[PDB]
């Protein structure tokens, strides 16, 4: 997204789109972790300050897509949700802490070249890879430019956009905002004098922040798109939910429901 690049087909087989039934519109991005489970940001389904609240059948899950807008028949798969599980300690009130939700699909999606799950991190992987400087990738169908007012920038893209972002050191992250950071969220982006740039933007919430294990070649979802101040602004970074930190909860829901 923002300062992104068109994705290749099947580059993110776990990417999931969150689609509203009526009106039909893109709500957020998500991710397939198994055949019956999708991971997204909690604020994608619940946000009291903006009266945002969607129940099970207020939305659909579109898996296997590349085109933002078209109905890719014989490629994408649309699922219906059996149940929505939001983190019980999710803080919509002050800092979006523990911004994570889980969704149980009525029926398990089938895997193809376009649909395949991503891995969740484990101690050794979270440990080795989540070090500042390391680059992760964030994909989405969101705005190519900041929404903030009446402004130009190639609206939304027709295809899914990928941008490889670098991980930023904590003191830097917390000095970049007035919101209260928490160990359950990291921040990624290029600093002013680095030259390069890119950021998730509106429409990418819930999207995966992935990393590639050079120790086994597997892609791991290190984060989820949560919040940001503007998009691709200088001196600002995007904040992502810390999956590993929440992996214990993710396991409880799945090993019970």
């Amino acid at each position: 997204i923002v300062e992104g690049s068109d994705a290749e087909i099947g580059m993110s087989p776990w990417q999931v789109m969150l689609f509203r039934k009526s009106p039909q519109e893109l709500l957020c991005g998500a991710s397939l972790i198994s055949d019956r489970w999708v991971l997204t940001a909690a604020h994608c389904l619940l946000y009291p300050p903006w009266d945002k609240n969607f129940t099970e059948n207020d939305l659909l899950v579109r898996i296997g897509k590349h085109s933002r807008t078209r109905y890719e028949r014989n490629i994408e798969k649309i699922s219906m949700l059996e149940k929505i599980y939001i983190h019980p300690r999710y803080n919509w009130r002050e800092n979006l802490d523990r911004d994570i939700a889980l969704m149980k699909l009525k029926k398990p999606v089938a895997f193809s070249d376009y649909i395949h799950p991503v891995c969740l991190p484990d101690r050794e992987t979270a440990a080795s890879l989540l070090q500042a400087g390391y680059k992760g990738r964030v994909t989405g169908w969101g705005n190519l430019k900041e929404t903030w007012t009446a402004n130009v920038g190639k609206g939304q893209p027709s295809v899914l956009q990928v941008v490889n972002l670098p991980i930023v050191e904590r003191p830097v992250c917390k000095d970049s905002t007035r919101i209260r950071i928490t160990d359950n969220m990291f921040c990624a982006g290029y600093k002013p004098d680095e030259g390069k740039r890119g950021d998730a933007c509106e429409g990418d919430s819930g999207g995966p922040f992935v990393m590639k294990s050079p120790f086994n070649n597997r892609w791991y979802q290190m984060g989820i798109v949560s919040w940001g101040e503007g998009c691709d602004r200088d001196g600002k970074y995007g904040f992502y939910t810390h999956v590993f930190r929440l992996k214990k909860w993710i396991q409880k829901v799945i090993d019970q429901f």
């Binding site: 689609f19 039909q24 659909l60 109905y71 649309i78 219906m80």
Partner: peptide
Amino acid sequence: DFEEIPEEY
């Protein structure tokens, strides 16, 4: 401007 979702879904 999203294409019409197959009404069975």
